[PDB]
């Protein structure tokens, strides 16, 4: 994130970390939309241009995290995926249309002060909140600046 | 452990929704209704954008009606990070919601 600030702990209880078993590394962000379903971008798993096609046994999902680096004992819940669903009309070639995928967890996670699901919009909320000018909020452990660096 | 560029702890940034025409005019790519763009305009002085590694993450909005947080988008793409005249793109969750329903509600919804 560029021009952001350190988040208060527990600020985004729905924040999920998509991580790779081997080699170990941060792959992407995601959101817990319930105790068993995680939402993320289809390109985080499938992007042929970069020779990327992760299946279920390559990824772990780390929920309840604050720090990008360390293993957070008390709060963090690491989990494995049962299923993976990439939108059938996902278009990586032309425009990255339908860039959406759902991760089904092995078994339901246990909510806490640090692990709570976000709501999905509904017609009325979409219509009321989605207006140019209105602000939303983005969170992540992504880079702080454009890269010419690591 | 940590450096500079890759942050140590989770980061946040509140961004304004940009109107569709402006988003379209901002890129040569064939934007779609399934995506929206957000970020400050060059005439705004305020900076801020999602960047590499933030992909898949949520773009949420807190409702002023009920006080719940809704996920409006997913960090999809952009052309670099925080360039003036450029806007970050995000998948349109409400528009793809019917598909989300179908798969969660066992291939039917």
């Amino acid at each position: 994130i560029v021009e952001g600030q350190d988040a208060e702990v527990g600020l985004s209880p729905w924040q999920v970390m998509l991580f790779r078993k081997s080699p170990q590394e941060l792959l992407c962000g995601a959101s817990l939309i319930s105790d068993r379903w995680v939402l993320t971008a289809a390109h985080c798993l499938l992007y042929p241009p970069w020779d990327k096609n992760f299946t279920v046994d390559d990824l772990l999902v780390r929920i309840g995290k604050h720090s990008r680096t360390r293993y957070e004992r008390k709060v963090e819940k690491i989990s494995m995926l049962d299923k993976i669903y990439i939108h059938p009309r996902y278009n990586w070639k032309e425009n990255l249309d339908r860039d959406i995928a759902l991760l089904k967890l092995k078994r339901p996670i246990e909510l806490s002060d640090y692990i709570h699901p976000v709501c999905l919009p509904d017609k009325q909320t979409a219509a009321k909140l989605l207006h140019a000018g209105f602000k939303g909020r983005v969170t992540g452990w992504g880079n702080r600046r454009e890269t010419w660096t690591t | 452990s940590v450096a500079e560029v890759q942050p140590s702890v989770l980061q946040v940034v509140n961004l304004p929704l940009v109107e569709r025409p402006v988003c379209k005019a901002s890129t040569r790519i064939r934007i779609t209704d399934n995506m929206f763009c957000a970020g400050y305009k060059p005439g705004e002085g305020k900076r801020g954008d999602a960047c590499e590694g933030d992909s898949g993450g949520p773009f949420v909005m807190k409702s002023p009606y009920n006080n719940r947080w809704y996920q409006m988008g997913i960090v999809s793409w952009g052309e670099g990070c925080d360039r003036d005249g450029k806007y970050g793109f995000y998948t349109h969750v409400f528009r793809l919601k019917k598909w989300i329903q179908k798969v969660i509600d066992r291939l039917g919804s």
Binding site: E25, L26, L27, C28, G29, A41, H43, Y47, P49, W50, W92, K93, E94, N95, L96, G142, N143, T147 | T27, R28, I29, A50, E52, G53, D54, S55, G56, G57, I74, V75, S76, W77, G78, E79, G80, G88, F89, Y90
Partner: peptide, 12 residues
């Protein structure tokens, strides 16, 4: 071609 127009999927 997304890549051709400079489009950039979000770690490198």
């Amino acid at each position: 071609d997304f890549l051709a127009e400079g489009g950039g999927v979000x770690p490198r």
